[PDB]
Subunit: 155 residues, 10 copies
């Protein structure tokens, strides 16, 4: 599978994608209709973090009026990473980084307690975000991280 060596080409496309998305006043959910894939995956791809299968690449390119060059580049594996600074400054992204900063030691401790030595995978991995009401007024976001346990065993 084709892969990218640098972010520059996939970043240029992402700017074009965002330009068309705003110009047409489209939501990611609207862009994702007809892909057969999850919104979180296709939104990540459009923001340059995943390749798309051909059918998904052509349906988003149809809604955004993108040409064939964009369809080919959407199918290429990018050089991944949404936070080049390592630690974000944007408050929305920072809160998610802060969750890991606070509970990082706890998540390691409980993973080792309930699963054993090793990791929870970030590749054999799926992500979901859901809007639920708050019983005391307002809304909450439930973000589900679903990762395979990979054990570390002596060899």
């Amino acid at each position: 599978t084709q892969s990218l060596h640098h972010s520059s080409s996939r970043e240029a496309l992402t700017d074009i994608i965002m330009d068309a998305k705003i110009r047409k006043n489209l939501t990611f959910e609207a862009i994702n209709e007809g892909t057969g894939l999850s919104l979180a995956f296709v939104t990540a791809a459009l923001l340059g973090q995943h390749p798309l299968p051909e059918q998904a690449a052509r349906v988003v390119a149809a809604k955004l009026d993108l040409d064939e060059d964009a369809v080919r580049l959407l199918q290429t594996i990018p050089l991944r990473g949404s936070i080049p600074s390592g630690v974000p400054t944007d408050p929305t992204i920072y809160r998610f980084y802060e969750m890991v900063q606070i509970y990082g030691s706890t998540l390691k401790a409980l993973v080792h307690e309930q699963f054993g030595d090793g990791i929870i995978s970030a590749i054999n991995f799926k992500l979901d975000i859901k809007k639920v009401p708050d019983p005391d007024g307002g809304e909450r976001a439930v973000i589900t991280l679903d990762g395979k346990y990979l054990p570390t065993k002596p060899f």
Copy 2:
């Protein structure tokens, strides 16, 4: 409420906690028996990231054979942060960081799309981890991030 200016004295207590835990071969779940609180919160408190209410601090110090000085220190608010390096080197913790590194801009975009401008809070926030079977053989971790949406409104 009493607060700490540094992480060191709470780190010294954390070292005493982990030593007693290893010496007694105790799980965090067993230590959490009878607190009335979530295992994620209490484990984080033991690892120096949270204060404990008095009843929970006494019940943990009783299991770990800790003195009254530990009881008072467990009730003090710490200077928080489980990853002083900013980005972890430990693979288990790094995977959670990588989840944010990869999906950080996607989470921002989808939060703004489904909620609006603002953030998902990391303070009005609860964390949970559950072990589920993998349909293709193996174990999976389902980590749930549950935060309040705080809107950014023009003023």
Copy 3:
């Protein structure tokens, strides 16, 4: 709501805004005349840190002779962050960074003493700057940070 994956397209608009502002010899106060919003919020929005509602975006656009593409982009939520390096070199901004560096631990200590565990929010939050006379001669700036207390409670 429309969001921006990175700030350079908003940076380019910010460059155009500042260029029009200098050429027309305009103050932010004059630009803000018909927005119906606070000068602090709208100046930040012009500098790429906030979106504007449509009608407020149109009134700064009429002042600065910006086109409809600028009106659409001004309404988009940016990737926030006004200090790229994390630490400013500019003396004016640095003094505000220095206030946090000097009194940061005091602010935490007194928040915990007077409110309890948790944070003062930087999202449910309003900023104001006011010029007052100095009794000994000269002028002083009174900057008001007004943030909601969000408690950290055991769960």
Copy 4:
């Protein structure tokens, strides 16, 4: 006036002060009784960021049961800086850092618009934090930053 060349010897006193404070269940407000100085300044001094005049040093040393060496060290000017990393990990401190990250360019812009070229001082400067009720439920912190304007004039 006596001054210090490093953080360490003042850090050791700050550790002793915080240890005695927690062991005696004292608030910073109770420690500040009789000093004739503001809670924000004295709290900062106890946390290593300011010297205290002799009478203030003796009354906090009596309340905390500190010896004559502590009185002298409390009157010494420290090497200042409450955030050694430059960027805090603690959420309570981080929020104030975030306020500067977001509004830093705005603060500079309005300082130059409303005052002129130059800075708002961080030395000819006072800080206050006040707890007020939020009209819609809860509490808010009103943090006031009050600094002298120092002009930059051509020479």
Copy 5:
């Protein structure tokens, strides 16, 4: 399984281990006799990067005259990371870092071409080093990185 929250308790043991090794003039191969484990894994464990099963912990402890406290700690999962700076200064370690700096983009490209999107695991993974002669005089090291391919598939 017991885990550790930071380096120091294993760091202290690692120094004790190294001190005894140098005093007894032992090789890692000699220390590893009878464990049934690979020399690279056990050496890594002794250097504080892996836990050991009880049999291997008691075996290495017998060869180094370590007490039962060391046996228990050698069975605990450490906070992993052998290069705290992230980039080493030691030339011997730096050469392996240089290999990744030079061929990093190549390995990504060839992994995606030959395997597909995804990663080569560093957890489902074993390391080996072998000494072979150089056909033009001298010796060469053959280091084998053996990791499981984890695909990234659209979801």
Copy 6:
């Protein structure tokens, strides 16, 4: 031998090479046809990390429709380095960095035990990656680092 002072010019050529590669749907193995050189070396050269001999340079230029300016720049020694950030964010690349992070001290210890004082060369060095079917289902990557032992030695 001609060498480049920066990454800029060689980066522009890599963009053109990757664009031609994606457009023609070519593998690095297809581009490597009839060069007589290993796929890892030529791929690294195409990615701007090595110069190519004129014959190989003309071969891959023919298959990618590159002009004589590309033939000449492919023969120049670049300013090497594939990971500008020092630590990668891309998960595929990061896994290889993590192997050095975890096992770096072990590789140093075993190099010194099995060879002596000195280094395993990153210059007198060849890399190879092979796909090896994994026994438990799936595939494994066996990556071999083959470097010459260069002794460090009193003088």
Copy 7:
């Protein structure tokens, strides 16, 4: 007064200024002939670190054949900072950085001894450089830093 949010716009003007200065073989002293201001202040302005008053900006524009847009931009307050890297690589600039690196703690100690707690201002501040003969042959630079003392007084 008009202010700038980024370094680049004045950076472009500085490049224009330097290009015109080199083409005309002018010294900063010649350019400063009719400004009515100090050489050190005006040179810093031309290098993008200060605004010029209107009549002084028109003098330097006449010497350098700059247009009215340059005159306007020269009167805008910049985002200040001449060493974006924080520490310079240039040897001429580095020597001044090194004087502060070496004598920084001494300057603090003697400021506190001779003035009291507080700072020597960098805003109420003038700089001067003078060339004097060295008694042992050669030349010396005498750089004078002249800053107002701002006390830190308890409040």
Copy 8:
């Protein structure tokens, strides 16, 4: 001359020097009585940045009641540097760093204009600090940097 390889033994001595100086309530000017050397040089030596000739070392040790070990250590050349973080956080020291930050490019430009290519030395160099009254009220510090010009000539 005896030189020091790291800060620590000179660090500990500096701690002892400052401990005795505060306990005796001494000034650096009093400690410097009878050295025949400048206050800035001797203060920097006490702060770990310079060696002292034996007779100067013995008189500062006699004022502080230090032993013969301190006298020998004071004569050794330290590993120099008063700001280990590269950029200071202390406000008094930061102002001098900011001076170089703002005027660094101006100093280089006027050195090359008035002297030529090369540097103003930080080694063939003297520093002086002087307190003078401000005509408008208050006090000012006049810091003199006096360095030899060393040219860069083509060779």
Copy 9:
């Protein structure tokens, strides 16, 4: 003497210089013919690290067919520094950094022993590299660093 403010206009010339040297397949020694200056100085100047006297500037300009704007710019003093990252990643440059990293404290200790307190100058300094045969087959590089000794004397 004409000086520069930033790297880029001289960087643009260095790109043009390097582009012409590759297209003409010239060596630096060939470009240096008839300059009267050493290859090490003129190579550095062509790489943007030094100014050239006018004759040397016109000579290299005729060799690479550059205009009079390049001749004048080549006579300007640049903002020096060949490694913007501070630490190189290119292996060829890194080895020279490694030499200082490994032997830096030794050079300091031996400079102080054989010369005294102070420095070996990097400005009153000449560099030379020569190729010599290795008695065991192959070739060695003998790089000579020739710097004036500048003493640090008490003042």
Copy 10:
């Protein structure tokens, strides 16, 4: 050969070495009597950067009155690196770093011109420093770096 995992144990020995050296008023040259090794290698070993053969280790220990444990520690391979900050602040060391900063790209260029692709090794490497007179008065240091050329050949 025995090797060490961290710098601390050898750092403690280096501290003891320097203490005895200063206490005995010894030069590195006098400590190096009878080793049959060059001053630069043994000095670096004493500073924790190289191991010593048994005989050389015993002679420096007899000169410095170190015990048998120091003789064994002196024979172990350290974790190398004399500049933990990456870039030194000490002026004597910084000058040598500045030589590479300035001439780094020149050294690479001339190495590739005179030798070919590849490196000049820092392991098959010898360093020397000699004091020669300056024809204009004073002394100069001639530091010779003698490294084997290792080519990068296509494979």
